[PDB]
Design a protein around this ligand. Structure first.
Ligand SMILES: CC(C)(C)c1cc(NC(=O)Nc2cccc3ccccc23)n(-c2cccc(N)c2)n1
Ligand SMILES: CC(C)(C)c1cc(NC(=O)Nc2cccc3ccccc23)n(-c2cccc(N)c2)n1
Length: 261
């Protein structure tokens, strides 16, 4: 065994956080005083090999804005242990009590962190496949990090990805565009009123969501750039990041606080 492997009694599973039928996720403590999130396998549901294929991927991906692997126990019972992101998922964070105080400058900063996480994925030649607010984790002081809860999200998926299976970093770009509409509507589901097949049909014909209320036209323009038909036309995460980091100087220097944004 290797560097990640830790003894089982060095963990304390304190609070149940979530359960699917492939296992559980707990908030916990590792050795002394180290808050951790601990993921569990429900025995019988998937291959011990296949469950630990997740931490096999997280060992090779290290960056400030992707959730970080801490430890691995690799005989049953097995556990994957990461840093604790204390405020939960970005979708819940936008919708809940705390979603009503977020204004355009906190939201654009959030998008810039995620672009940064995604710029690193982009430089690593990796592909997310499921970039959306449900898979972004939030910590203290509005820190965001890219994650994957490992669950059909046609509403967040590019036409070439949904129809023909061509998932690339260019399809994660399209979803980032969709993630942007999530931030600007406080977590609302994209294409309001529309069902999957009506979405898949309207979009092929050239439909793209309109500027959300109070959101600046220049930010809708970036979503629209992320939603080009031709995957290669779509911008780079290095571009998306720098454009969001620089936003209130280069692009909307006369921005003024509103009711929701
Ligand atoms: C199905 C599966 C993978 C066991 C699961 C687990 C969770 N929930 C979480 O993992 N929640 C949390 C993870 C990490 C830190 C958290 C901090 C505070 C509250 C929840 C957290 N899930 C979840 C539940 C509800 C919404 C979202 N976005 C994710 N889903
Ligand atoms: C590409 C990237 C963003 C570095 C990533 C991260 C993960 N894994 C996770 O995010 N796992 C977890 C998500 C949410 C809560 C967790 C709590 C404890 C342990 C892992 C968690 N990934 C992953 C890889 C392979 C399979 C699965 N399901 C997930 N991928």
């Amino acid at each position: 065994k290797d560097a990640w492997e830790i003894p089982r009694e060095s963990l304390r599973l304190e609070v149940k956080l979530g359960q699917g039928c492939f296992g559980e996720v707990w908030m916990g403590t590792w050795n002394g005083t180290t808050r951790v999130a601990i993921k569990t396998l429900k025995p019988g549901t998937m291959s011990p090999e296949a469950f630990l294929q997740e931490a096999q991927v997280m060992k090779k991906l290290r960056h400030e804005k992707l959730v970080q692997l801490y430890a691995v126990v690799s005989e049953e019972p097995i556990y994957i242990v990461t840093e604790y992101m204390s405020k939960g998922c970005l979708l819940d964070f936008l919708k809940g009590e705390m979603g009503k105080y977020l204004r355009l400058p906190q939201l654009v900063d959030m998008a810039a962190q995620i672009a940064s996480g995604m710029a690193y994925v982009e430089r690593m030649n990796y592909v997310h496949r499921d970039l959306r607010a449900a898979n972004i984790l939030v910590g203290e002081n509005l820190v965001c990090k890219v994650a994957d809860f490992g669950l059909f999200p046609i509403k967040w998926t590019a036409p070439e990805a949904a129809l023909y299976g061509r998932f690339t970093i260019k399809s994660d770009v399209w979803s980032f565009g969709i993630l942007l509409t999530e931030l600007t509507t406080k977590g609302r589901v994209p294409y309001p009123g529309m069902v999957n097949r009506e979405v898949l049909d309207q979009v092929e014909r050239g439909y793209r969501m309109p500027c959300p209320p109070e959101c600046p036209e220049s930010l809708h323009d970036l979503m629209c750039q992320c939603w080009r038909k031709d995957p290669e036309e779509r911008p780079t995460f290095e571009y998306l990041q720098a454009f969001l980091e620089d936003y209130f100087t280069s692009t909307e220097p006369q921005y003024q606080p509103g009711e929701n944004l």
